[PDB]
């Protein structure tokens, strides 16, 4: 149908046609007559993996033989979501599957949406990785993705009564087609024991055995040939483990409960010995996996030339005293050597601020269960501090802010600590990000070591986030200035030569409105709800935080209601106000939320004087494939974190690329993407990260704002009185008491700017020829957020390997 | 090389060498450089599966068209072993896959070897329903199995200092390409609950539910282009089961353990819930699989004519009350009819008549985890004894001893009268053992419904158990009289007209030796012991139990030694005497047995004296794929139970078939075995029946045997003193204790008699040719322990089903 979707030869689809019906046949043991559309798309699939296994056979053949630097990407997540789409288009392959389905009498689209999200991530980091792997792959680096396969990832989340309910996210029920389980390299990993110290130097021993078992997938690059691994591990015991008899076998669960499950919680730390587990077992199982592989190129000078172990975040950060246990316990090097290797092959990425995501493990976690790093770490810590004090002699303070033992009831290892002296590079993931590590919370090791800071600014993929999820918008981009902004998207600045043709002005146009069409049909067919097409899409989606100020918007939600019952008889731009996130199970506050913005929905979207000018819908179970629906959909993106801490965001980013305009704050990648296309073309409010300090060192008294403000005020009394929650009148009195005595984040400070500023959005919606010619100066200037700048720039200035556009053989 | 392996076509041969290829790369994702042999045998596995799909789809959809009569085989227990080779003989691939393999470089027969053998079965019981499954399929019966697909099986048998040491059957680790899941058709079973009375009936309600996802595996017909279905079920959780968070994923575990695990208890009794849910899960799962397809062909008089469900044992015996609770409760029959609808459905087999082997469950339990159920089965109870008191007026004890409910301290439910209340026919397995059920344990049961009770004597296949595990003979026998005999057992009595062929007896002889040395080689490669393969093969194996009398063997070994140090340098025939067989985890005696097995040989196999004319050799990990090469390699086959102790045997068999003789007592198929050779033939031993009931009645004193034979009061005065222990001199005192004051099956009553028998085989290996001969006998006359032959007489006596040979199209 559309250009960038590929050929559809005769000989290539008849190929399809006939590996479709094989592998229905052969593979799944179905004929036509019983098949359900799950056979279809699994027919299918097997029929795309196909295509696949020759390349990825030849892309490791060759890093054999070529011996490049080699790139290890730890993450104890990987937001993968669907593959069967993300592998068409990177194989050029989505024609000619979609003419070869069609010519079967099938519609492949149908097809696609039966694939199960891949949902081994809670949010922005793990989706950070997914981009990351996938822009690695199109720029020809030697990398690879190492993680834990969770059986059940991100819960599932359905809305009971307006409140979150969690079900397990059964993801490999059905079968995962684009793995390849390698059992054959299954690794020892070991917990507990204790430390024997010999002549032969420290001996870990009385250990407990977990089997880490890896499995393959591949992960394609953007029509180059190059096909990259993400290898997982899974936990299986030994079977000599417990080993009356029946029990024994049950209890191989305890060690196998290592990979079960995925922890739930976006930027906040739970220190519970699981989750240590977990990210001692991914290290463990990886390290040995690098270290295979290099000793096939006893001599470790040459190793942080041959590797580079990229750590995101403090997750895998027991990479650094793990490959030093290696190194001298095991290969015998002298200390600072070893100490030369590690700090020379790892690399660390900090993606939070906010203190309570900080990972603090506490030392007696560390001391039953990884004895021998331990010592290690306070080897590490005693000779860090010694530099220390020597670089800032007398300067105690110093020596006791920088240990990385924190003292207290409870002592505890500061894992940000340990990885940026074990680290040759730290960065942030935007430039306000990066710049904040070296004036607070790292100021004293930024002082100490000035040259390991740097900012990698994040991305996104632009063939999940353009090509794949709106081929319409990629195509009329296409007809003007050619498909090589898919792997070079800087092109798209070519469009602002464009801004002034009133035909482009009208392809952009209805593709939004194409967009919005078809995602308020899915609305009404999947969940039962009609949605004014013409109205504003006024969407926050992003995981439910009380930092992300879901209240914020809450409150002008409500502040728009209060207008339209005041002046019923005004006109009002219209506006479907789509809110949408998981709340981490245990976060009291972010389910109170959840419940507020269905309350709201409840009293909005049943008032027969509202009419269609307003509706307020909860998105229900948030997550990748949903995503892909709703950006391309949006007009309005809601990026209104309080300043200072949103590390970058990059939702902000998916939304700019789809034709979004963006309200926000400076915050995070924000200020780089206000920058990159005008601050006249970005709705900024609100304060800057400078007045936040200025208001927390007088202190911030919500009261203040409360009693300045008629329609502030007004708000807080429905929330209070039981306007919103008539059978249980006192059901948001958390939210009340939180907002006007212990807000962390200002949401009245910056409620007053917010709402002049929707006001300034909603005039220019009025004027829709003036809205779209904004819309292209966004979607032109959106080219520095691809994720393949972003790793260029990790590749060239953090693991000293050039990126290549060039092919691999097919 | 053979004619009963196939045609080795060009053609045949071309395509299986390219898809091969074809599955090393796209499925296993492997180039040649880096395949191991594993990798080789999955790519060969999964050509060989190709081959049964095509059948599979055909004839299961010619059993929807043609809707027959369909049974369903309810077994607890598959012991099916590797399915490759097994696969390619039924299919005639053997040749053609040898020389596919061979021209690509690789020895088919070291590919087989890899295959882990499926133990998901404890010994006879377990086989017997794998041999049947076949049988069935070859005789084109619209058959089921219907079992549970446990993770681990019979556990690894591990000797250690000569002890017993188990490990987990991790047998699913490299994945199992013969099964294919079908999580579409997952079904819900129900636990714990209470009983509602409404109106309209009685409702089982608040239930913990446990779906059930079933596996298929193809069981493939001899050369029929038949394919019929095992159906195994696996415990999964719902998504919503225990929905802090982590936790509640974390036990999904407790619902999956039903699936987990084989109790590894060979013919006795633990009464533990779990297994008592996964005789409910089999059950439950599988009656609603049978209804739907039902009904596919809402009126239950004609159920009985469309389906068959025979219970093998009572291990899923709760099939009948479930029958019930669906007929009454959901279909809303009324009682009677239900009833009647049921026992014509079901039948059961009886295969043991030791009382520690009976299930009786505690009613505390079925009260607790299936209350709707006891309810059912008090109220059959109740109307089976009505009928017994007006067949039997004023027979009280009767209706006491007849009860489905057994009264005591504890309270329990009696599976076997249920179940011969609840079915049409009740059968036993051998001649002798269907008497025993007539004349005592079941003696009430014929007196009201001497109709109910069958004999189906035991059967083998001889695909596995002949053209599959000994070729050679196989060969020999085709060469004579040709091929229809392995579909056709009978026909092996034309092999008594060769009897006196100098030629045959020769050949006979050579495959015996060529087994004999391929055996002894195995031995010294895998497991480091060398044999004398000119001496006899004297092989005892099976389950470790007291009935089965390995300690009869025992003292017989002891005697050969002692004979031989007493007089060293008198001439005797060589013999090794191989004891192999699993114990169960807790069965302490069983444990202790092989205990004295490897001590003995200890002492036998160093002692200069004996040299090369007594070994004894323990057989580590019993199962179905050593039983495979073990078994054509023994002379001597011991079967040596107690008379009345064992069902039938079938190993007994397997010996027959493959040219060996048997040493054995009239018990269970030995009676028929020997009746079918000639008595003359045979190596009987030892008290009948008659005799061990007249030793029970005067009293079982075994001093008296002890205080009568000089050689059995050495033996046990060695035991005692420490002889066959030096360092632990009381070892074995739980051993002679039990001999002396606790024998349940008298071993020392049949020693004298076992030992002068003994010296009558050893006076016969000294004349090969006479021996040979003998051999002929035995073989040509083992037709009727095909388990054709068995099935056939079910399909015609109990199913009501016409038996087929012809072929599907192919
Ligand atoms: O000894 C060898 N000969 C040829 N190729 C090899 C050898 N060892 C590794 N390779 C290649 O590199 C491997 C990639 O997987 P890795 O071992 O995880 O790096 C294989 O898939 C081969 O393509
Ligand atoms: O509606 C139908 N049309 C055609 N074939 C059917 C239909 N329902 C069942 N079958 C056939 O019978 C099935 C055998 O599996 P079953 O449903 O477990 O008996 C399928 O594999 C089909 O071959
Ligand atoms: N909030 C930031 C985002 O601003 C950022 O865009 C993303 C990728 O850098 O990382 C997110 C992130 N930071 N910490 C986590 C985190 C911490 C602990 C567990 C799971 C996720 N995620
Ligand atoms: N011992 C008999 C054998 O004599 C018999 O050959 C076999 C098949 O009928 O069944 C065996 C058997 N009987 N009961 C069991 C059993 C009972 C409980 C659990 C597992 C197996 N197995
Ligand atoms: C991109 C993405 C995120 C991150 O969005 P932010 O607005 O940066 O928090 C979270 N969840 C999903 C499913 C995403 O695709
Ligand atoms: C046939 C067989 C049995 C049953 O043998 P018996 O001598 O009848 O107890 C037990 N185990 C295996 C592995 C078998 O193949």
Request: overall charge neutral; some cysteine; proline content about 4%.
């Amino acid at each position: 149908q559309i250009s960038v979707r590929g050929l559809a030869g005769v000989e290539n689809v008849t190929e399809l046609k006939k590996n479709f019906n094989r592998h229905l046949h052969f593979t799944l043991v179905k004929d036509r007559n019983v098949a359900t559309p799950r056979d279809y798309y699994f027919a299918l699939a097997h029929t795309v993996r196909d295509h696949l296994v020759g390349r990825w056979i030849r892309t490791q053949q060759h890093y054999y033989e070529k011996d490049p630097k080699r790139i290890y990407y730890l993450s104890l997540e990987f937001y993968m979501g669907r593959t069967l789409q993300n592998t068409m288009v990177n194989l050029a392959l989505e024609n000619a599957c979609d003419e070869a389905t069609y010519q079967l009498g099938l519609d492949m689209e149908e097809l696609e949406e039966i694939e199960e999200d891949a949902g081994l991530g809670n949010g922005g980091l793990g989706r950070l990785a997914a981009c990351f792997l996938d822009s690695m792959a199109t720029l020809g680096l030697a990398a690879y993705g190492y993680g834990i396969r969770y059986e059940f990832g991100i819960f599932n989340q359905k809305i009971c009564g307006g409140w979150q309910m969690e079900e397990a996210d059964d993801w490999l029920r059905y079968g995962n087609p684009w793995e390849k389980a390698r059992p054959e390299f299954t690794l020892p990993v070991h917990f507990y024991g204790r430390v024997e110290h010999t002549s032969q130097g420290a001996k870990w021993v009385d250990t407990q055995v977990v089997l880490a078992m890896p499995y393959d997938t591949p992960v394609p690059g953007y029509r180059n040939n190059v096909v990259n691994t993400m290898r997982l591990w899974s936990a299986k015991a030994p079977n000599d483990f417990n080993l009356g008899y029946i029990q024994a076998v049950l209890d191989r669960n305890l060690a196998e409960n290592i990979s079960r499950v995925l922890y739930p919680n976006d930027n906040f730390f739970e220190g519970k010995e699981l989750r240590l587990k977990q990210e001692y077992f991914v290290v463990a199982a990886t390290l040995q996996d690098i270290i295979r592989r290099f000793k096939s190129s006893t001599n470790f000078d040459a190793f942080p030339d041959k590797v580079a172990i990229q750590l995101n975040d403090t997750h895998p950060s027991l990479a650094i005293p793990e490959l030093m246990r290696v190194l001298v316990d095991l290969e015998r090097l002298d200390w600072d050597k070893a100490w030369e290797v590690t700090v020379k092959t790892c690399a660390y990425t900090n993606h939070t601020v906010l203190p309570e995501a900080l990972e603090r493990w506490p030392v007696h976690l560390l001391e039953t269960l990884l004895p021998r790093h331990l010592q290690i770490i306070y080897e590490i810590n005693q000779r860090f501090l010694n530099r220390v004090a020597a670089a800032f002699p007398g300067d105690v303070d110093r020596l006791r802010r920088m240990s990385l033992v924190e003292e207290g009831a409870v002592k505890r290892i500061n894992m940000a600590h340990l990885c940026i002296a074990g680290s040759h590079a730290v960065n942030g993931v935007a430039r306000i990000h990066s710049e904040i590590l070296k004036k607070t919370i790292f100021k004293d090791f930024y002082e100490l070591e000035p040259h390991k800071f740097q900012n990698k600014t994040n991305g996104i993929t632009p063939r999940r986030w353009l090509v794949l999820c709106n081929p319409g918008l990629a195509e009329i981009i296409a007809e003007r200035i050619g498909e090589e902004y898919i792997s070079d998207l800087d092109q798209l600045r070519k469009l602002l030569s464009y801004v002034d043709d009133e035909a482009f002005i009208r392809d952009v146009a209805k593709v939004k409105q194409e967009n919005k069409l078809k995602f308020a049909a899915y609305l009404e067919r999947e969940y039962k709800v009609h949605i004014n097409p013409n109205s504003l899409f006024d969407v926050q989606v992003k995981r439910i935080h009380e930092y992300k100020r879901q209240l914020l918007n809450c409150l002008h939600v409500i502040t728009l209601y209060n207008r339209i019952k005041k002046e019923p008889n005004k006109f009002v731009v219209p506006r479907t106000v789509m809110i949408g996130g998981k709340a981490a199970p245990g976060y009291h506050m972010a389910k109170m939320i959840i419940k507020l913005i269905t309350a709201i929905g409840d009293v909005v979207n049943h008032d027969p004087v509202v009419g269609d000018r307003l509706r307020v819908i909860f998105l229900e179970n948030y997550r990748v494939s949903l995503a892909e629906k709703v950006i391309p959909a949006a007009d309005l993106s809601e990026q209104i974190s309080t300043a200072g801490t949103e590390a970058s965001g990059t939702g902000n980013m998916k939304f700019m690329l789809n034709g979004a305009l963006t309200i926000g704050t400076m915050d995070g990648a924000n200020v780089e993407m206000a920058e990159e296309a005008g601050e006249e073309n970005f709705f900024i409010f609100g304060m800057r990260v400078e007045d936040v300090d200025r208001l927390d060192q007088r202190g911030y008294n919500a009261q203040e704002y409360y009693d300045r403000i008629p329609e502030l005020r007004q708000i807080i009394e429905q929330l209070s009185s039981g306007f919103f929650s008539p059978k249980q009148p006192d059901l948001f009195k958390d939210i009340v008491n939180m907002l006007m005595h212990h807000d962390r984040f200002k949401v009245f400070a910056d409620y007053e700017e917010y709402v002049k500023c929707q006001e300034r959005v909603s005039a220019l919606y009025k004027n829709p020829r003036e809205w779209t010619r904004m819309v292209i100066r966004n979607i032109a200037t959106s080219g520095k957020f691809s994720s393949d700048r972003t790793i260029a720039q990790y590749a060239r200035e953090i693991w000293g390997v050039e990126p290549s556009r060039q092919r691999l053989p097919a």
